[PDB]
């Protein structure tokens, strides 16, 4: 995915709050590079198969987390957000950003009663 849809944000104290997609991409790339290196040296096959199984599990966790096997947890014991979690929920893209949005030239305040007004009139501060 393009890098502005998974950006890096800086907290107040100078610490970074990176997304959850960057971790999953990093895991996939690291396992892929390690497996390619092992295949280059002509390693024993019983270890190459372990690497292949781990790579399958990594790509599966990137596509959808906790569907087939075990959920991948991050810093805390909370699950990471995969690609399917972006679109699927009630707080996903469809119901939160496309079927209703925030707008400009808008305000909000408390209401009181106004007599001596005509219907079709309102009082704006």
């Amino acid at each position: 995915i393009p890098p502005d849809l998974r950006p890096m944000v800086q907290l107040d104290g100078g610490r970074f709050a990176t997304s959850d997609l960057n971790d999953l991409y990093r895991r996939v790339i690291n396992r892929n590079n390690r497996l390619a290196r092992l295949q280059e040296i002509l390693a024993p096959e019983i270890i190459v198969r372990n690497e292949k199984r781990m790579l399958q599990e990594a790509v599966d966790a990137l596509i959808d987390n906790g569907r087939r096997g075990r959920t991948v947890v991050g810093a805390n014991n909370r699950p990471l957000k995969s690609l399917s979690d972006i679109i699927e929920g009630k707080q996903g893209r469809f119901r939160q950003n496309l079927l209703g949005k925030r707008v400009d030239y808008s305000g909000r305040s408390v209401i009181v009663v106004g007599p001596n007004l005509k219907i079709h009139q309102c009082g704006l501060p």
Partner: protein, 47 residues
């Protein structure tokens, strides 16, 4: 949306009579006279 003279209601006026009067005004006079009649009734009741 005119020409229909109101009847002199010589009786007590609860909520049902007010709803009936508003309906009659809409049916006979239009949608801009009902607002005026409702505003006048609101002023009289508040007073």
């Amino acid at each position: 949306e005119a020409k229909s003279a109101p009847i002199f209601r010589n009786r007590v006026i609860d909520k049902k009579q007010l709803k009936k009067l508003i309906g009659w005004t809409f049916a006979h006079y239009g949608t801009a006279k009902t607002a005026v009649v409702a505003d006048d009734l609101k002023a009289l009741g508040f007073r």
